[PDB]
Homo-oligomer: A and B are copies of this chain.
């Protein structure tokens, strides 16, 4: 039996640019066995949770140290846990599609080619570069729902996936 996330107590507006990526900008090359899509900006959307819902006083895993430079309000815990933003951008994360991740070309002559995490909760994509930019304080909160070990969360990110720990929201973790 899978464990459901606790109920949301409100709404949160994804604080980063959100995207549609369905038009293929570039076919799969040999060295890059995936399409680079056309990243089309969408008007803001709301996760079905409140910022308070994902916060609490457990430390974040902070897989990639983006949170170690100062003091932040902690994680709700109870099975909520930040995901490795930086890892999710790697070629391996993309090969594995353990999460749904498309590569995209942002609008404009100078729109960077970036890696986008898919958010089913609002049917949109969010740039991993936007989220994980230096001192952007972006955090991908997933919910761990494998019942093994009283809901205890493995130490290696590679063991995670949309089935076992689906993304619940993307936030900016406030400062404490």
Binding site for B on A (CB under 8 A): 1, 3, 57-61, 74-82, 147-153, 155
Q: Check B150–A60 contact: CB distance below 8 A.
A: yes
> Separation in Å of the A170 CB from the closest CB of chain B?
16
Say whether, besides A77-B79, A78-B78, A79-B77, A57 and B152 are in contact (CB < 8 Å). no
Which 4 A-B pairs give the minimum distances between C-beta atoms? A77-B151, A152-B153, A81-B150, A58-B150
Which B residues touch A152, using CB under 8 A? 61, 81, 152-153
Q: Check B153–A58 contact: CB distance below 8 A.
A: no
Complex-state Cα separation, A156 to B61, whole angstroms: 19
Choose from B57, B61, B78, B147 the contact partner of A57 (Cβ within 8 Å): B147
Which B residues touch A57, using CB under 8 A? 1, 3, 147
Complex-state Cα separation, A1 to B75, whole angstroms: 13
Which B residues touch A148, using CB under 8 A? 58-59
Which B residues touch A3, using CB under 8 A? 57-58, 77
Q: Check B61–A149 contact: CB distance below 8 A.
A: yes
Chain B minimum-CB-distance residue to A82 = B150
Q: Check B1–A150 contact: CB distance below 8 A.
A: no
